[PDB]
Amino acid sequence: KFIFWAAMVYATLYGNYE
Amino acid sequence: DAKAQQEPDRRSQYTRHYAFKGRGRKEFLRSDMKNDANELVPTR
Amino acid sequence: KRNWKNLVTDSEDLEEKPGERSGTNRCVEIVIEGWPDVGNLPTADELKDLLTVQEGHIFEKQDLLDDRRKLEIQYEDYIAEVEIRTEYVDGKSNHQRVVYKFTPHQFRGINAIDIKGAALMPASEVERICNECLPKQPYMVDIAVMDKVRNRIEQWYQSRGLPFCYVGFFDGMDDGILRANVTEAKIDNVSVRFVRPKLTGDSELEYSVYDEGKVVKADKIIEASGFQRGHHYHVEDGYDAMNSIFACGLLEDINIEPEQDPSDVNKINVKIRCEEVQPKSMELDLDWSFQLKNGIPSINRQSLIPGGSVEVSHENLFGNSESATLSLSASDWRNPSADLGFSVAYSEPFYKPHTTRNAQLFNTRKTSTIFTPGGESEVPPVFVDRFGLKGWTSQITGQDNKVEHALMLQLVSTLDENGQVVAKGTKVQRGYYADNGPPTTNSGNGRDLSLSYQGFFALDNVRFINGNQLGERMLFQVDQGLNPLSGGIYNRATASYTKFLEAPFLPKLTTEQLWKERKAPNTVVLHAKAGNALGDVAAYDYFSLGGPYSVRGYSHGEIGAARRFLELATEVRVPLKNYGLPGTAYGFVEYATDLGSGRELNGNPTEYYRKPGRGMSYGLGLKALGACRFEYARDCNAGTGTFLVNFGERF
Amino acid sequence: RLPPMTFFVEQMSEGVLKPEGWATMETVAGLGEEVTEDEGAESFNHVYYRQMYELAVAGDPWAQREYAAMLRAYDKGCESYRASYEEADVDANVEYGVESYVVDPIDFGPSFDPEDMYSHRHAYAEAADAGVTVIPSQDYYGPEHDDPLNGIVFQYEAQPFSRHGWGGVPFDLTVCCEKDKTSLCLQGETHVSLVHSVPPFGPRHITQVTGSWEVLRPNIKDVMYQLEVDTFKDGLLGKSDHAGCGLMLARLGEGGDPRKGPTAVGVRLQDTLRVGPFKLEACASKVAVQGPTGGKEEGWGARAFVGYDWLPGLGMAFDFIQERTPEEGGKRLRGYGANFTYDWEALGAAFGMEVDYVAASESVFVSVNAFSGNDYRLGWLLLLPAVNYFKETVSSLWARLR
Amino acid sequence: ENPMDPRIRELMAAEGMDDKLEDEGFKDTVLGSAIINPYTGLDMKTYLDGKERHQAELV
Amino acid sequence: LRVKTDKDLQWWRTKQRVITKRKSARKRDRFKKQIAVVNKKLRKKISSKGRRYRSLSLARYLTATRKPRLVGLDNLTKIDNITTLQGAFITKEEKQDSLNLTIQRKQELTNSLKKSQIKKRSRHSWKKRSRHQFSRNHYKYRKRHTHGNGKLRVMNKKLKKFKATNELRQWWWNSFLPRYLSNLQ
Amino acid sequence: RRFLHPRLDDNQRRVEREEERVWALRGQQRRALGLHRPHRPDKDAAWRLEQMYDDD
Ligand SMILES: [Mg+2]
């Protein structure tokens, strides 16, 4: 919905750095 | 009658609290946390 | 840390270049030349320990440049010329020592030193400070010894208060004598200024300045300050002036400042600024409510009536500094007679020498400890709610001795988790509430109206000798019923006595153990308490036995209620800090009886809940962090031991 | 037996947060000479000295100079600070004798009691410092003839894995304990902060782990565990944009065992943004709690604050919950609210107005408070409730005379 | 190649501002009382420092 | 409607009132809205200075009342610091001589007029009632945690770091690296 | 009237004798120099400051 996929958009793009 | 018909009270201020007993627990709000400064000292 | 010379392992066989010296350019030696040996400047070693260049480490031209700039800019009154150079300590290697050469400002002939002026400083030490500051050769003398001489004299005056007595100038210098001249100033003019600030939302305060105060008179401050013409200025004079002017109690702030009067350096002008208090204050806290049937916000005339509270405060009633606070709170101002709340406080700090006088109209709701589960499993709690007026006087005397005299007019109610009154206590038998109870009040309907007198006397002679207090303490309390009104005529008296004695079955500490290694002694504590109640005592004023600050290891009212009672306790305390460990260890035994006076109460609560009349307990404990106690105690009426965690010290 | 899911939704959406950082030893940072405060400089110094230590160990004389200079300042500051301790101890042994200093007793407010009846129990010798702090914890209804405080709250705070004042892992812990012969209360909370990068070595990238536990005997006979892992970074959409994400797990362990019982899982986001003249701070959350026997229950929450340049004194906040109970196709239960505040000064008084809208029951709550520290001109409205009381007195006094 | 080290540049800049404040104080003590132009309130300290432009704007 | 430029300090103080009120602007809305819709080693301590955004704000309450006391060693008095009967202030060397001398003079163990007494609850009624009352009323008049001078302090430090980064970059590329690569041959 | 009043009176009298010792020492200290007398305040100020100290 909104706070499952976009709650993993931030998780994936935080994993994209570290 | 209009004032007393809303027996649910005015909404009260939110605090983080424990589930069982409701004692307050500490918060990390940025507009308060950005003013804080600590240091380190040797012990005796 | 500490002399990095294992980094200079680039020795004479570990690196090679054919025609050039090989290695890294390490500093291997720092030599300081031309530094004066005057006492006001640091010597060569801690001058060496503040340079950017370090021995055994590498460097560059920038380090020498910033060292030269920092040394030239730090001591420009004394040196003002540093030259820094390097030289190789050996061929075919890049190791090189760096030397620092200072040429201080010199003064071309000073043979003698003289001190002139200074009519307050006696001749016994002017001779020794003139003898100390002498150089050896007369011909080329550095400037900085000048700065040594006044660094004696100034310090002497700064050791004796006196912040306006200083070495002015040196007036010799043509006959070879360095002659300091001491200036000693005196008070000439005392003036007072009257200001008040203004309350805005700005961060900077603006003022209204008056030539004369509205209440206080201008010569009163000058007479109170004790500032005379022709006197020296002492800092303790300013402290005494602050105390004596600020004694009046009508001042918010006061600034005392002495200034040099630069037209004449032997004068001092003291200026005083004082502010009165602004005593008036009030606070209004309203709330509204509008019901939206549709977009119209219901703007009828009987809709702007609020439901807030009013607070009005005033200090400085009746000329002296006594203050009053008043509060009303109605939740609906079109029907204020529903749940109207009212509060009044009146305080008087300067009623009498060492005495304050107070009055208050207030509320209290607490839990009754009489109706507790003693031998019956479950019991509904009873709540004591008092509302009313109390007026009292307090004295502190003998640095901690306390006397309080109070007169009380109160309304007392007994409740059960709600605003609903009860008249009897009750228990559950199987699933049913029991019958006819012991009564909770004196009128039998659960509400009482009482007029009472309360006296309290406390005598303390207890002091903490490296922790672990010693001495004795006595407390006395009398309650008297004055109403012929729903309450009865009663007299309820309590006396307690605690002695902290040094342990007699052990060797006693001596003075060097107390003062050098800071050892605390081993103590015993002996405690007694007793109480009596005559007349018609109501159930919210019975004595209750058991709990903390009673026999430990019991519930808070587990031993029965009482009309007369006796309580005894003893304890042995050892400090662990004498063996390096933190905290202190103790062991206790305690006891209490109602002296067979359970039958004496109305309704007999000690047999209704099957509580015993007596109880003894013992245990061990550790006190760790200030006044945090961890006990293991053992009930002896049952035979079970429990751990307890408590704050604060008993006895 | 688990708490309602609105509790979790309120707990996971409470504004834009900010984690715990490194604290610096002031005498070695800015070697010798006095300093000032700045977050980026201290954060730079902490990672800079670990880097220079690694390079100095590897060889590298330029790093060895910097690390040795820091060591020199470290030794000098430490010896100075122990000298200050010795001077303070000698001054205390001069001012008092073998006597100790005694704290103020706690003030509990007025009572119908002589108010120094038990004040001698809260005046104790200091101990000065051991690392932890204690406060007493008080209940709402105390016993009648005694002091109301019952429990003790302990607080500890440290920075364990540092080398020479260049710390690693900020850490703190808080435990409330109330023990007597009947009940047992034991609450606890711990936070651990982990710093991955600071500028100029990266962007500011910090994660935080929180754990908490709840024991309350003999009322509940189950214990409560919560764990929160949440991560923040400054950026991701533009320069200096404070974004963060997080997850939360919770359980009610039956009999104390953390392997059995109902569970709660939730996730949250935060962000700030600046478009036009509008600056907004928003956060949102979704919780997927398990019921006692019913199964999945899910909820959505969101908060927003809209800062505004022009009219810089109007505060306005918006809040939303959505509830999804079983039979989800026709039981979507929404709720949203608005809040506005403003502030004036007039008649020598400071006025503040707050307007609140709940939007389920269409009610507007207005509340104005004032404060006049100058005069009693603000009391002219006090004639409003004083009239009606008279109209409720005579009408009583008529009916009491019939 | 060898610029002035910061912490020294700013320290000497602040001490230079202290020197400027003492300069203004001494010059106002010595020259600030004599009147050059009585119609505008121009004094010798303002006039000899080349600040007559400031005085016209101030009036 | 576009973007406010020209933000001065009065704007910042007005916004700082809102930033203060943010914490009380949060309420326990959610279950109330559901109910209303369903019916239908080292030690870490606080800083020695106060906190961030420092400003030397005012100089008003500079004077305090002292008590002239006796000291735990004999023939010494103290109003702010200890004076040693010749008018001088006492030094480090005199304290140890006085302690070694009062070894003998404390051997009589005379206990009278204790140095730190057990403090009562009603110790200073005037002081706890009204000591800095104008500052509390002045905080009731403006509702800002932070002062504008601390904001100017922090902002100017940040602008200084930004500018200094710009000269570091320009110095690096135009001065240091060409010379360093020339010296590399 | 026979046990509590004289004990408190005796303790208070010891307190004023200690205060007079303090002011005698201050006068002796300022007599050791060539200075003036410390100018103590009167008794009304003494009990009023006993209610309104800032430092002990
Ligand atoms: Mg608790």
Short mmCIF file of all heavy atoms in Angstrom, two decimals, chain C residues 339-357:
data_model
loop_
_atom_site.label_atom_id
_atom_site.label_comp_id
_atom_site.label_asym_id
_atom_site.label_seq_id
_atom_site.Cartn_x
_atom_site.Cartn_y
_atom_site.Cartn_z
N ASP C 339 -19.59 22.66 40.01
CA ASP C 339 -18.32 22.09 40.47
C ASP C 339 -17.30 23.19 40.72
O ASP C 339 -16.15 23.12 40.27
CB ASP C 339 -17.79 21.06 39.47
CG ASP C 339 -17.74 21.60 38.06
OD1 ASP C 339 -18.34 22.66 37.80
OD2 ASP C 339 -17.11 20.95 37.20
N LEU C 340 -17.73 24.22 41.44
CA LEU C 340 -16.89 25.39 41.70
C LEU C 340 -15.73 25.03 42.62
O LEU C 340 -15.92 24.43 43.68
CB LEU C 340 -17.73 26.50 42.31
CG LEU C 340 -17.06 27.80 42.75
CD1 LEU C 340 -16.42 28.49 41.57
CD2 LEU C 340 -18.09 28.70 43.40
N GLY C 341 -14.52 25.39 42.20
CA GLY C 341 -13.32 25.15 42.97
C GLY C 341 -12.70 26.44 43.46
O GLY C 341 -12.67 27.44 42.75
N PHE C 342 -12.17 26.40 44.68
CA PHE C 342 -11.72 27.60 45.37
C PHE C 342 -10.45 27.29 46.13
O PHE C 342 -10.33 26.22 46.74
CB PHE C 342 -12.81 28.10 46.32
CG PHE C 342 -12.52 29.44 46.91
CD1 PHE C 342 -12.00 30.46 46.13
CD2 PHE C 342 -12.78 29.69 48.24
CE1 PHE C 342 -11.74 31.70 46.67
CE2 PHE C 342 -12.51 30.93 48.80
CZ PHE C 342 -12.00 31.93 48.01
N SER C 343 -9.49 28.21 46.09
CA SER C 343 -8.25 28.02 46.83
C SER C 343 -7.69 29.37 47.25
O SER C 343 -7.75 30.34 46.49
CB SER C 343 -7.21 27.26 45.99
OG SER C 343 -6.05 26.99 46.75
N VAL C 344 -7.15 29.43 48.47
CA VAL C 344 -6.57 30.64 49.04
C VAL C 344 -5.27 30.26 49.74
O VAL C 344 -5.24 29.30 50.51
CB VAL C 344 -7.54 31.35 50.00
CG1 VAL C 344 -6.83 32.32 50.93
CG2 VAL C 344 -8.60 32.10 49.24
N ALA C 345 -4.19 30.99 49.46
CA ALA C 345 -2.94 30.87 50.19
C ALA C 345 -2.52 32.23 50.70
O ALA C 345 -2.64 33.23 49.99
CB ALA C 345 -1.84 30.28 49.31
N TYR C 346 -2.02 32.28 51.93
CA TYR C 346 -1.53 33.52 52.53
C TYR C 346 -0.25 33.20 53.28
O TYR C 346 -0.25 32.33 54.16
CB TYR C 346 -2.57 34.13 53.46
CG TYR C 346 -2.11 35.34 54.24
CD1 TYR C 346 -2.09 36.59 53.65
CD2 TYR C 346 -1.71 35.23 55.57
CE1 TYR C 346 -1.67 37.70 54.35
CE2 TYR C 346 -1.29 36.33 56.28
CZ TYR C 346 -1.27 37.56 55.67
OH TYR C 346 -0.85 38.67 56.37
N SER C 347 0.84 33.90 52.95
CA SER C 347 2.14 33.63 53.55
C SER C 347 2.71 34.92 54.12
O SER C 347 2.59 35.98 53.51
CB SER C 347 3.11 33.04 52.54
OG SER C 347 4.32 32.65 53.16
N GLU C 348 3.37 34.80 55.27
CA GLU C 348 3.95 35.94 55.98
C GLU C 348 5.32 35.52 56.49
O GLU C 348 5.42 34.79 57.49
CB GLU C 348 3.05 36.38 57.13
CG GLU C 348 3.50 37.61 57.85
CD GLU C 348 2.42 38.17 58.74
OE1 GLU C 348 1.29 37.64 58.70
OE2 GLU C 348 2.70 39.14 59.48
N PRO C 349 6.41 35.95 55.82
CA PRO C 349 7.74 35.43 56.15
C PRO C 349 8.39 36.14 57.33
O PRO C 349 9.19 35.54 58.05
CB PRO C 349 8.54 35.68 54.87
CG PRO C 349 7.54 36.12 53.84
CD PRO C 349 6.45 36.77 54.60
N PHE C 350 8.06 37.40 57.54
CA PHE C 350 8.72 38.22 58.55
C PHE C 350 7.74 38.58 59.65
O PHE C 350 7.66 39.73 60.07
CB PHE C 350 9.31 39.48 57.92
CG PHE C 350 10.24 39.20 56.78
CD1 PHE C 350 10.01 39.76 55.53
CD2 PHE C 350 11.34 38.39 56.95
CE1 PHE C 350 10.86 39.50 54.48
CE2 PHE C 350 12.20 38.12 55.91
CZ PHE C 350 11.96 38.68 54.67
N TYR C 351 6.97 37.58 60.09
CA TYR C 351 5.99 37.77 61.14
C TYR C 351 6.65 38.12 62.47
O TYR C 351 6.20 39.02 63.19
CB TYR C 351 5.14 36.50 61.26
CG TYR C 351 4.43 36.29 62.58
CD1 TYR C 351 3.46 37.18 63.02
CD2 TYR C 351 4.73 35.19 63.37
CE1 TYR C 351 2.82 36.98 64.22
CE2 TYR C 351 4.09 34.98 64.56
CZ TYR C 351 3.13 35.88 64.98
OH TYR C 351 2.49 35.68 66.18
N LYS C 352 7.73 37.43 62.80
CA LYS C 352 8.38 37.51 64.09
C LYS C 352 9.81 37.01 63.89
O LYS C 352 10.10 36.39 62.86
CB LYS C 352 7.62 36.66 65.13
CG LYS C 352 7.86 36.91 66.60
CD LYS C 352 6.98 36.04 67.47
CE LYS C 352 5.59 36.65 67.62
NZ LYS C 352 4.80 35.93 68.66
N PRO C 353 10.74 37.36 64.79
CA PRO C 353 12.09 36.77 64.72
C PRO C 353 12.08 35.24 64.75
O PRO C 353 11.53 34.62 65.66
CB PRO C 353 12.77 37.35 65.95
CG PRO C 353 12.20 38.72 66.03
CD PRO C 353 10.78 38.63 65.53
N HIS C 354 12.66 34.66 63.69
CA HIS C 354 12.75 33.23 63.41
C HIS C 354 11.39 32.55 63.23
O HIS C 354 11.29 31.33 63.36
CB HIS C 354 13.56 32.47 64.48
CG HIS C 354 14.82 33.16 64.90
ND1 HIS C 354 15.87 33.38 64.04
CD2 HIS C 354 15.20 33.66 66.10
CE1 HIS C 354 16.84 34.00 64.69
NE2 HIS C 354 16.45 34.18 65.94
N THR C 355 10.34 33.30 62.91
CA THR C 355 9.00 32.74 62.81
C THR C 355 8.36 33.13 61.49
O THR C 355 8.53 34.26 61.03
CB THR C 355 8.12 33.22 63.97
OG1 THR C 355 8.86 33.18 65.19
CG2 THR C 355 6.90 32.32 64.14
N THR C 356 7.64 32.19 60.88
CA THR C 356 6.78 32.47 59.74
C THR C 356 5.34 32.12 60.08
O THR C 356 5.08 31.23 60.90
CB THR C 356 7.21 31.71 58.48
OG1 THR C 356 6.90 30.32 58.64
CG2 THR C 356 8.69 31.86 58.22
N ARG C 357 4.39 32.81 59.44
CA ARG C 357 2.97 32.59 59.66
C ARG C 357 2.26 32.33 58.34
O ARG C 357 2.39 33.11 57.40
CB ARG C 357 2.32 33.78 60.37
CG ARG C 357 0.90 33.51 60.82
CD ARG C 357 0.46 34.47 61.89
NE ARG C 357 0.39 35.84 61.41
CZ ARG C 357 -0.14 36.85 62.08
NH1 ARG C 357 -0.66 36.64 63.28
NH2 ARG C 357 -0.16 38.06 61.56
#
